[PDB]
Write a protein that binds this ligand. Structure first.
Ligand SMILES: C[C@H](CS(C)(=O)=O)Nc1n[nH]c2nc(Oc3ccc(F)cc3F)ncc12
Length: 346
């Protein structure tokens, strides 16, 4: 049966939610989207409810709405944000115009936790382990996060971690901004068709920052950032240069004075030698040669957490819709079907 819904004004819009959800309260000061904390009286869980902003206003937006719902419905993993519930107050497709998504409420993001400070090596081990455990799962479904950074890593009091915003402008990537500091060079400057290992670069940047309390590559712009990157990892060799399909980018890279890879032990003074080794394997310029999430989990740095029988992979994820061209109402009908067919977790 259909639950009873009640109306409330929260984030300049009227939220219409099932009675089970009580004490709705906006969180994140707009940073996470139109999101409210709530108490789910049915499960006893503290939850986060996200209302999608004008989800079917254009073809691009309607497809994005479908994409996010498909992604959230697929993800069933401890270290990845998943769906506890999805609902609409609509009784039919013709009425359908709002989508509400429900997940676990997490106390903070990693960025607000790290607070300019060095973390203990054990804390770094545990946090990075969880990120890699989640990424192994995500990557096994042929999904790429693309924008992994401390602000989309949600963490509770016990340091338990869940990955937000997976699989989803020029101005906000401009300048001295955290929005670009964790990006692999190949994607930051559109060198080539990029793969899953862009996410591994990001983990390396995050891991280094947890170990030192400092941004690894705090570039003031795209060019400044590239120079910071290349000083640490060295300028590309001939092999990688061939792989830069963008003739323009390839030609610029060649104009830079060649630099050798630095000694990471001299860069990360005092750090666990195993952490240094892993950082070296993650922060490789050639993306073909970066360590994978599955491989990184088996690295000696995670000896006290690694368990090959407790690091699950995902069911197959059909993303053929990505190369499909449809009308707004067609994307909207596909979305409606996915809402209606939702089965809650036990
Ligand atoms: C990280 C943030 C910190 S807080 C409570 O200060 O806003 N807490 C959050 N816990 N759970 C969260 N979920 C989101 O986004 C959602 C993602 C998927 C959903 F189904 C529902 C959501 F609300 N954003 C944010 C959070």
């Amino acid at each position: 049966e259909r639950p009873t819904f009640y109306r409330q004004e929260l984030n300049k819009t009227i939220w219409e939610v099932p009675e089970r959800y009580q004490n709705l309260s906006p969180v994140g000061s707009g940073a996470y989207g139109s999101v409210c904390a709530a108490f789910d009286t049915k499960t006893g869980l503290r939850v986060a409810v996200k209302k999608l902003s004008r989800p079917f206003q254009s073809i691009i937006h309607a497809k994005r709405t479908y994409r996010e719902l498909r992604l959230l419905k697929h993800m069933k993993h401890e270290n990845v944000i998943g769906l506890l519930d999805v609902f609409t107050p609509a009784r039919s497709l013709e009425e359908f115009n709002d989508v509400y998504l429900v997940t676990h409420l997490m106390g903070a993001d990693l960025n607000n936790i790290v607070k300019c400070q060095k973390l203990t090596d054990d804390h770094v081990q545990f946090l990075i382990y969880q990120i890699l455990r989640g990424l192994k799962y995500i990557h096994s479904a042929d999904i790429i996060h693309r924008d992994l950074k401390p602000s989309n890593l949600a963490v509770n009091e016990d340091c338990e971690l869940k990955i937000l915003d997976f699989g989803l402008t020029d101005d906000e990537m401009t300048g001295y901004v955290a929005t670009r500091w964790y990006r692999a060079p190949e994607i930051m400057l559109n060198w080539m068709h990029y793969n899953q290992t862009v996410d591994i670069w990001s983990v390396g940047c995050i891991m280094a920052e947890l170990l030192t309390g400092r941004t690894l590559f705090p570039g003031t712009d795209h060019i400044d950032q590239l120079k910071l990157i290349l000083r640490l990892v060295g300028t590309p060799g001939a092999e990688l240069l061939k792989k830069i399909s963008s003739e323009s980018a390839r030609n610029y890279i060649q104009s830079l004075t060649q630099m050798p890879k630095m000694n990471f032990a001299n860069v990360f003074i005092g750090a666990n030698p195993l952490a240094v080794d892993l950082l070296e394997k993650m922060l490789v310029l050639d993306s073909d040669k970066r360590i994978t999430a599955a491989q990184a989990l088996a690295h000696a740095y995670f000896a006290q957490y690694h368990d090959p029988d407790d690091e699950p992979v995902a069911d197959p994820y059909d993303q053929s819709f990505e190369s499909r061209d449809l009308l707004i109402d067609e994307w909207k009908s596909l979305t409606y079907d996915e809402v209606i067919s939702f089965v809650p977790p036990p």
